[model samples]
Target: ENLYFQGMKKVFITTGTEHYLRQLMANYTGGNVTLLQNFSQSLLYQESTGEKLFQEGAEYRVLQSSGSLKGFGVVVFEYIHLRDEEIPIFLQMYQRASLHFSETPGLQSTKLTKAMNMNKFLIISFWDSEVFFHDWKKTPLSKEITNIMKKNNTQSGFSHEDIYHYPEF
Candidate 1:
């Protein structure tokens, strides 16, 4: 677990072919590492876009490709903020939704955490495959829980997924 945690250190976005993406993930063995695609809804979010390539150097050039791999789906990372008074409602809604997510198959795990800023929060989730993740979305329970989440004073935030990871990189 320590090795996995240490190896899973940084995440970057780049544009690359599936061949390269798989090679990237395959290169990092002996641990449970994942890569997912980004699906940000918030205008405030500004990562993984093509702009990084010019500013950050060639390493970020992979941010241009729209390509994604099969089997390995999205590892979701969502960022949002809630008012102090609304935190309890958000937690209660998330607790109920977490139960739904946990009961669903293909979902490896879901973690909720607060950022340095008190109101800021993040939701990270791992799935066995993209297919399984979408399958869950089609369920009525999923829809119900999602609605519950949005209705509970929760604000839409930026979200992204891992599409590839190279521990050595």
Candidate 2:
């Protein structure tokens, strides 16, 4: 096992999609899954240490309104004491899932106003170091996703931003 106290990664991914993607997640969640692990948006707080307890994720939430006229979903992946081999699994799953949002019916809108870039879809993955993060992205699967985004992704009305943090403890 490539277990090391390297660090913890907190990732936030936002994506917009047709109702189908929404339905897929709903069917995947058996209600009980949310009750125990932090599948959706549930936060686990350890009272003893004033820390979080859950290992999977924190919580889940679904939101949509007429003003937005869009469907959005988010899921958190926690890589605790993770291994070198696990990188492929993460990249693979994310690659497959995102393809849905980039395609037809899977992609709900063609107009830039309702496209994936304009606050329609986004993802943030936290890692221990920029070097390791870049290394993972260099993988072939990741490169494919990058190419797909470059060709199909829209720019008009799209707002993208990224921030890196240094732990304060």
Candidate 3:
């Protein structure tokens, strides 16, 4: 929590071997990089950069966030994809659910980011501990949220473990 986030407006992500990832970070002209909490067992990094790094792959616009990305024990990276014209409806529920999430104990922070040029959004949340997160997962509120998302056809992708932010020069 002590680390300054620098409030990145854009991010780029890529996967490779640790050796390769290190070189890639060194090649980048500017900005910062942090290891992502992932489960694929592959090396991944989140590029919190002010400039674009690639023509295409995966990029995001920092939309709205509820907490800090540092000092948390576990980070949950959840995705929501909207169909047709459900942006308003989805966001309404998103905000609605977020309010509930804010009240939950152990939730450190959450950020909603939109994938560039797509109807996809990522809600990345940090918790004080996995115990807290798992406990919250089995609650009635969590179940209800899941039901609403299911009805609205919002899908996901999940995996949150640990992080180590590389100090930027």
Candidate 4:
């Protein structure tokens, strides 16, 4: 299948488990920010088992094709501030997002036995501008998110990381 969202950059937040990790659970954040609106698109799997997973809502992904798109799934982090602003806020966002999805329903299996930091990465990716993104960070809600992240970023199956890539369209 083919999908497109024009207007801005894309943000990817991935929560993953090891090959041994299995099962699914629903995610419900009883914290400050409620789910505004969220959706995921599925792409053809480059891997064998991934093909079967994609058939269900259990997996979603993207593949590079002859079109205008950028893809990254290794890590994702969200901040209440822009990348140009303070560095601590970015760290906090990444940490928090990781924790939130670590326990995501259906995705949470058992604790990973491997030496992985945090298998799940919560991403705050979008095409919002630098200035506009900064404004969102400065809001009171941003502070709330940061506070929550700092408080609970050390869960069993998650860790946070962030990056900003400039795509050439």
Provide the overall lDDT of each model, using Cα atoms, as 2-decimal numbers: 0.44, 0.30, 0.58, 0.28
Superior by lDDT: candidate 2 or candidate 3? 3
Better of 3 and 4 by TM-score: 3
Query: Model 3, clash count?
Result: 1
Give residue 50's lDDT in candidate 2 (0 to 100).
Answer: 18
- Please estimate how well model 3 matches the true structure, expressed as its whole-model Cα lDDT: 0.58
Q: For model 3, state the Cα shift of residue 109 in Å.
A: 1.9
Candidate 3 lDDT, tens digit per residue, 54-158? 622367766665755454366655555666477676666667777777678888777677777776666666677677777887876456445645654533543
Instruction: Judging by lDDT against the true structure, name the best candidate.
Output: 3
**Clash number for every model?**
11, 7, 1, 8
CA-RMSD of model 4:
17.4
Q: What lDDT is obtained when candidate 4 is compared to the true structure? A: 0.28
Per-residue lDDT of model 2, residues 59-167, tens digit only: 1111110111122222113111112465356445654654543332212221111111122333333334445445545556446446544543353332333333321
Model 1 C-alpha lDDT versus the unseen true structure: 0.44
TM-score each candidate.
Answer: 0.44, 0.29, 0.65, 0.29
Off by over 4 Å in 2: 1-119, 152-155, 159-163
How well does model 2 score by local distance difference test? Answer: 0.30
Write one digit per residue (lDDT tens) for candidate 4, span 123-155.
233323334445445545456656645544543
Q: lDDT tens digits, residues 9-126, model 1? A: 2223334454565566565443233433334221111123222223221211110111122234355454455667876776676666656664677776655544432455555555
Give the worst 10-residue stretch by lDDT in candidate 3: 159-168
- Ranked by lDDT from best down, the candidates are 3, 1, 2, 4
Model 1 lDDT at residue 163: 29
Best by TM-score: 3
